[PDB]
Every structure is written in structure tokens, then in C-alpha cells.
Amino acid sequence: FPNTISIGGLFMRNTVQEHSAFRFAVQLYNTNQNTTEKPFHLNYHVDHLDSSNSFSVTNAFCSQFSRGVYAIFGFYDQMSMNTLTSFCGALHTSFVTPSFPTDADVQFVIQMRPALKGAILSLLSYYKWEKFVYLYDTERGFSVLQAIMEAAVQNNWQVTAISVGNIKDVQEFRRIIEEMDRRQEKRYLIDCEVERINTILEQVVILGKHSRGYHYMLANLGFTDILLERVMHGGANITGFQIVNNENPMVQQFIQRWVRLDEREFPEAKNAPLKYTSALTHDAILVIAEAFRYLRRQRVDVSAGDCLANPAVPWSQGIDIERALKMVQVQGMTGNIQFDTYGRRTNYTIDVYEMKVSGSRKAGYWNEYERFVPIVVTTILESPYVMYKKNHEQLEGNERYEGYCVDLAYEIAKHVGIKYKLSIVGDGKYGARDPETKIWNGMVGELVYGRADIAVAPLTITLVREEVIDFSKPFGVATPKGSALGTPVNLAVLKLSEQ
């Protein structure tokens, strides 16, 4: 058994802190005094990628492989995911990565980041969400998207998915929020990188739509690194996830010894919050060190060329190494550590945080077995149907309207048992179709496109409209297609007529 173990390192851009944790964690292992806990020295070879062109990524990997390493620890993103994953599998070299888990199962890579699809789905059922907006990108895989859309069919939800992956101008973000606001959408499910989430919820506050009613779910680990001071002032609910618990004694010891380090040797150490990826980076050394300690106990023999060789014959000890790495069980900084056959984390735990005006609070945990143990009415102005009261300037609310229709709306609401907020269509027309643009206008246009629920007004009944919206019997009021207020209002007017 070699007296020293060499492992590779591949760090992409904007990962300076993770580099410090990688260096710090290795130092802690080396400085240990007990012979049993430190049976061999540990070395490492760092390298920086570009993640833009596969020539740089391929060259960097071959430099590491040719030099001679046992395992490789590094990050990858969408562009360079395929190059590193494919090379590692063919050459029989493990790859301990804290990056997002791969969508398709693959061998010889162990991804130590818990998935969220299970946690998200349970919370959606817990809050009983039926319709909402879903903003997403493709910087972390399609796994979450393919589960939300698949679950919508089985539960008959009304998800409205939007892809904001390629948006580069804040105008698109503003229009998306405004357009979905017109449809009375109060629930959003933001699943994007940290930078995008900051931009998205910076637009909501400028638009001033962080009031009491709206609820936001931030499906992204790293709930600490999201600016939330401004949004929470309005009172809008917010929900996030975390895996690093500050009350665990292990994190407290690491954090206590992590802030006293010299700045020059370990940049961005003391005056910066600790990203969860730093916690995963520290854990990786525990997993790799533990795996090699086991390999030493069993007296398993272990001991390079160039990547592109025909035929590509891999060194036979690779299978043993990954088996050891996929069997360890260590109580790490992020909780229990256990890997299944394909290398994904299992028996993990996510802590959900429901943060309020006073501050963040822990609202429960999501174990893998115990899952999450804790009307606007449109109308047009036409006397005597709807008219302004004697003094509409002083009055506020729907108390400034007086006429025939407002009386009818009150009677219908009382029968059904709802609350109505009278609104005036700004177009000023009953409704018609433009022959060239095929765009409805007026009351029917608003009613069809989901901007209203019922429409009490002198809306003449005709064949053209009846094909688009469901009227009631003549008195007729209108409702969207498939709305649940169709039958109750139809009977309400019929019984009113009989009296």
C-alpha cells in the first residue's frame, strides 16, 4: 500500500471559496496525530478549467490522468458535464463531485448532493397547491421539470411552465410577472440559479407585488445566499430548503476554526458566508479518506499512459475503488452520508425553512421514509345598469356604484355565497373578434383570457359569443369555459326569476 495518496482537482470559475475548503479539509486530515486515523499521507493537484470549449476540458483531464491519480474531485456544468463523465466511465477513474446529480444513471461518478424532486412534491401536496406559475431554467438538469409536469397529469393541476434560461434583459422578467399578474396568479415556484432568483425577486419588489397574498417557493439549496430582507417587509410568505444545520456540533467546531484562518492563504474565509457547496467539499474528503482506510484494512492491492489509446484497456483496480467509495457511511457536516448503487445520496434529510418578518424559522424536516414530518366581476358603464354614485371621489371600494347590474351582482353572490370586487373593463366595448388578428376585446376578451370570473352586464346573447363562453338563461351572465361557477349561477338566476 502506498505511503501517500494522490487525488486530482478540477475547479471551474467562480469557485474560489470551494478551493479554500478543499485545501483546509486536506490539512485537517494531515495534521491528525493518531496513527489509526492517519495511516497515509494525502496530496492533491489543483487545476482550473474553462467550461466553454471541450479542448481545454479534455486537455486538463488528460494531464491529471497521465500524471497518476486515484480519484478526481471537481465540478462540472451543462457544457462540460458530458466530457468529464464520459471519460471517467471509460477509463475506470472515480469522480467525487458536489455538483448537480446527473439526469441519467451513470457509473464511476458519485454525486454527493441530495435531490429535491421528492422534497418539492411533498410540500406541494402539503400546501394543497392546485394552480401556480413555474419559472425554471436548465442549469441543473431536467429531473425536477419532468416530475412536476408528470405529476400534474396524475393530479389534474394547472401548472404554467415558463423557461427563463436564455433571458438576458430585465424587460422580459418584468413582462412575465405583469402578464401572469393579470391572470390572478398568486403562487410562484422559482427554480433557478442563485443569481437569477435574486434578479427575479428584485423585479417583484420594484413592481410592488410582495404583499400578503403572494407566496413564493424557492426550490434551491443555498437559502442563505438569497437576498430576502427587502421582500419580507411586505409580508409575502417564502419557503426554502437547507441541508446544513447550524446546531450540529460538528459544523460549530468547523466554523469556529474556519474564521480564524489567515486571509492570504485561504481567500474568502472569514469575511464571507459559508456556502453549502463548501460543506459538501469538506465532506468529500471524509468520504474519500474513509473509503481508502477501508481499502487498506482488507489488504486490497492498489497502485499511467494517455487517454486516447486504441484499444482503451482500463486498469483493473478501478472497480474495487468505486465499490469502497459507494459503501462508506460517515456522519458528515451535512448529516448522514450513504450512497446507492448508482452513486446518488440516499437516507438524506432536508430541512425546510418558513421565513417570516421576525426571521427565519425551521418548519420541519423531510425524511425519505417519513415524508415531511412537520371573485372579480367585470361590468361596463351604461345607465341605468352601472353608474357612478353622487360622490364617487370621496367613497372608496365598490360602494361608489349604483344601478341595476350592481343590485343583480349582490343578489347572485348572496345565493352562491361569494365575495365580489366590481371592476370596469377599460376597453369600453362589449366584445368582438378582429378578422385579421383574431383577438377578442371588451368584456368577453377579458373573460376568455382568465382576467375575470363572471360578467354581469347587458351582454346580448348571440351565436358568435356562445361558442366561446357559457351564458346563463336570459334575464344573461357569462362564465369561462369549464368554470365551476357555471351551474350555481345558472340556477341562482332561474330561482330569482321565479320569485
Contact window for a copy of itself (CB under 8 A) among 20-28, 263-271, 394-402, 434-442: 434-442
φ, ψ of residue 436 to 5 degrees: the values are -90, -35
Contact window for a copy of itself (CB under 8 A) among 126-134, 221-229, 254-262, 412-420: 126-134
Is 209 an interacting residue with respect to a copy of itself (CB under 8 A)?
no
In angstroms, give the least distance from the CB of 47 to a copy of itself.
Answer: 13
Among the listed residues 14, 31, 35, 128, the single contact to a copy of itself using CB under 8 A: 128
Judged by CB, which is closer to a copy of itself: 81, or 228? 81
Is 130 an interacting residue with respect to a copy of itself (CB under 8 A)?
yes
Is 53 an interacting residue with respect to a copy of itself (CB under 8 A)?
yes
Provide the 10 A C-beta neighbour count for residue 132: 20
Whether residue 277 is annotated as binding a ligand: the answer is no
Is 354 an interacting residue with respect to a copy of itself (CB under 8 A)?
no
Which residue shows C-alpha cell 362589449?
Answer: 430
**Contact indicator for 110, 96 with CB cutoff of 8 Å:** yes
Which residue shows C-alpha cell 451513470?
Answer: 106
Whether residue 371 is annotated as binding a ligand: the answer is no
Judged by CB, which is closer to a copy of itself: 161, or 304? 161
Helix (H) / strand (E) element for 250: namely helix 249-258
Is 170 an interacting residue with respect to a copy of itself (CB under 8 A)?
no
Judged by CB, which is closer to a copy of itself: 166, or 256? 166
Is 147 an interacting residue with respect to a copy of itself (CB under 8 A)?
no
Which grid coordinates are listed for 187? Answer: 403562487
Among the listed residues 30, 43, 125, 163, the single contact to a copy of itself using CB under 8 A: 163
Is 272 an interacting residue with respect to a copy of itself (CB under 8 A)?
no
Which grid coordinates are listed for 213? Answer: 397574498
Is 356 an interacting residue with respect to a copy of itself (CB under 8 A)?
no
Amino acid letter, residue 139: E
Q: Which of residues 306-335 bind a copy of itself (CB under 8 A)?
A: 306-308, 310, 312
Whether residue 138 is annotated as binding a ligand: the answer is no
- From CA 205, how far away is CA 195, in angstroms rounded? 16
Judged by CB, which is closer to a copy of itself: 210, or 465? 465
Nearest to 145 by CA among 110, 189, 184: 189
- From CA 469, how far away is CA 455, in angstroms rounded? 11
Is 125 an interacting residue with respect to a copy of itself (CB under 8 A)?
no
Share in percent of the chain as helix, strand, coil (round to 5): 35, 20, 45
DSSP 370: S
Among the listed residues 30, 125, 146, 155, the single contact to a copy of itself using CB under 8 A: 146
In angstroms, give the least distance from the CB of 240 to a copy of itself.
Answer: 21
- CA geometry: angle at 209 spanning 203 and 213, to 5°? 140
Is 432 an interacting residue with respect to a copy of itself (CB under 8 A)?
no
In angstroms, give the least distance from the CB of 439 to a copy of itself.
Answer: 5
- From CA 260, how far away is CA 493, in angstroms rounded? 75
- From CA 378, how far away is CA 400, in angstroms rounded? 15
In angstroms, give the least distance from the CB of 166 to a copy of itself.
Answer: 5
Q: Which of residues 65-104 bind a copy of itself (CB under 8 A)?
A: 79, 82-83, 86-87, 89-90
Is 184 an interacting residue with respect to a copy of itself (CB under 8 A)?
yes
How many residues bind a copy of itself (CB under 8 A)? The answer is 51
Is 232 an interacting residue with respect to a copy of itself (CB under 8 A)?
no
**Contact indicator for 378, 480 with CB cutoff of 8 Å:** no
Helix (H) / strand (E) element for 217: namely strand 215-221
Is 389 an interacting residue with respect to a copy of itself (CB under 8 A)?
no
Judged by CB, which is closer to a copy of itself: 1, or 142? 142
Judged by CB, which is closer to a copy of itself: 204, or 284? 204
Q: Exposed, middle or buried: residue 464 (CB in 10 Å: 0-12, 13-18, 19+)?
A: exposed
Q: What does the DSSP assignment read for 305-361? A: --S--SS-PPPTTHHHHHHHHTT--EEETTEEE-B-TTSBB-S-EEEEEEE-SS---
Is 418 an interacting residue with respect to a copy of itself (CB under 8 A)?
no
Give the strands of the sheet with 41-48, arranged side by side: 41-48, 4-11, 71-74, 94-97, 110-111
Contact window for a copy of itself (CB under 8 A) among 52-60, 262-270, 339-347, 397-405: 52-60
Which 3 state secondary structure label does DSSP give 286? helix
Helix (H) / strand (E) element for 38: namely none
Helix (H) / strand (E) element for 169: namely none
Is 484 an interacting residue with respect to a copy of itself (CB under 8 A)?
no
Q: What does the DSSP assignment read for 40-64? A: SEEEEEEEE--SS-HHHHHHHHHHH
What residue ranges bind a copy of itself (CB under 8 A)?
53-55, 58-59, 62-63, 79, 82-83, 86-87, 89-90, 128, 130-131, 142, 145-146, 149, 153, 161-163, 166, 169, 171-172, 175, 182-184, 186-187, 306-308, 310, 312, 436-440, 448-450, 468, 481-482
Residue stretches of the annotated binding site: 458, 460, 465
Annotated binding site for L-glutamate: 458, 460, 465
